[PDB]
From a paper:
The N-terminal domains of p85α include an SH3 domain, capable of binding to proline-rich sequences, and a BH (breakpoint cluster region homology) domain. The BH domain can bind to and regulate several GTPases including Rab5, Rac1 and Cdc42. In addition, the p85α BH domain, either alone or together with the SH3 domain, can bind to and positively regulate PTEN activity. The p85α BH domain also exhibits Rab5 GAP activity to stimulate Rab5-mediated GTP hydrolysis required to inactivate Rab5-mediated protein trafficking functions.
To determine if the patient-derived p85α BH domain mutations impacted the overall folded structure of the BH domain, several of these BH domain mutants were crystalized and their structures were determined using X-ray crystallography. X-ray diffraction data collection and structure refinement statistics for bovine p85α (105–319) mutants (E137K, E217K, R262T, E297K) are provided in Supplementary Table S1. Three BH domain mutants, I177N, E217K and E297K, all showed significantly increased Rab5-GAP activity, whereas the E137K mutant had reduced activity. The location of cancer patient-derived p85α BH mutations with significant impacts on Rab5 binding (I177, E217) and/or regulation (E137, I177, E217, E297) are shown in the modeled p85α BH domain: Rab5 complex. These mutation sites are located in regions of the p85α BH domain, well away from the Rab5 binding pocket. Further, crystal structure determinations for several of these mutant BH domains indicated that no major structural alterations were present. No significant differences in protein flexibility were observed for any of the mutant proteins, suggesting that the mutations did not alter the rigidity of the domain.
Residue numbers in the entry:
A (entry chain A): 113 to 167, 172 to 298
B (entry chain B): 113 to 167, 172 to 276, 281 to 297
The structure:
């Protein structure tokens, strides 16, 4: 709620918001192999999780609390990682655009727009790297790229779209972008 | 024009773009008393000035070249220091509103909007501080708040009448730092 805009939390040459780096690195250190990471709610409520996003070393916290604070962070951003301007255009695309490659091309073109601060695309890239690292230990944490897209796309886009052939394409491109990080 | 957006050049807790700080500090060191600062075209063209804004110590350069690079910087920003939405609103209120105090209150309210990165208002504050510093030696450089407003308002707002109210806001904001 008091969480600043992504464009105010950091700037190049930094690669991601410092708070998001702390969360991701703590979660990867403690939960990379956790078979229920991001699929179980912790006991803390939103108010408690937000208190965490202000005050210590995050490794001190329960990994399930960190995972919930990670979700809380994405939800409390004034504008989502993928701005509504971008999602609005992607959803509007006709069925003749059957190509995931085209959807990806358009997301990158739109999100790299000069009207959108570079921090948004940088934050998405950092998150995709995190999701990819998780999917490379799928044999233990059970997370593949598609499930990660289905779990986190509603947090990255923050769009109540009514579910359609368009929404399947957005989930699909996030899936593809996770799997194709390196 | 590869110049990044103001919001991409720095972020809190930094108070202004690092390149703009270097320009301002060099100009104030070398040209605080120059009777023609910011009113003389130097021999350099935009390409040469951009060469300078794209990368060592700026004090090595002719002060009139630094002044031109300062202007070039404001012109090459992808979005102006005062965003188009803000200027548009202030301009459309031009016939109906007259109070300078109201315009100033509104400029601050609009530019502090959550939809606008804080860097824009921070950069404007830094620029106003520079312009005020110049006006304290106006007897020597001839740059008073009014002259500074007429020179730089078109660069801050990015407008080639209605503007007269905008220029007045910058003048007052320079004078009251």
């Amino acid at each position: 709620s008091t969480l600043p805009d992504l464009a105010e939390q950091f700037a190049p040459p930094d690669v991601a918001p410092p708070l998001l780096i702390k969360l991701v690195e703590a979660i990867e250190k403690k939960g990379l192999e956790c078979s229920t990471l991001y699929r179980t709610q912790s006991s803390s409520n939103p108010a408690e999780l937000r208190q965490l996003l202000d005050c210590l070393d995050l490794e001190m916290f329960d990994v399930h609390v960190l995972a919930d604070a990670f979700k809380r962070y994405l939800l409390d951003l004034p504008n989502p990682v993928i701005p509504v301007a971008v999602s609005s255009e992607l959803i509007s695309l006709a069925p003749e655009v059957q190509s995931s490659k085209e959807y990806i091309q358009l997301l990158k073109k739109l999100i790299r727009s000069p009207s959108i601060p570079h921090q948004y695309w940088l934050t998405l890239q950092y998150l995709l790297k995190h999701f990819f690292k998780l999917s490379q230990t799928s044999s233990k944490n059970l997370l593949n790229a598609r499930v990660l897209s289905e779990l986190f796309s509603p947090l990255l886009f923050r769009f109540p779209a009514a579910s359609s052939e368009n929404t399947e394409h957005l989930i699909k491109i996030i899936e593809i972008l996770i799997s194709t990080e390196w």
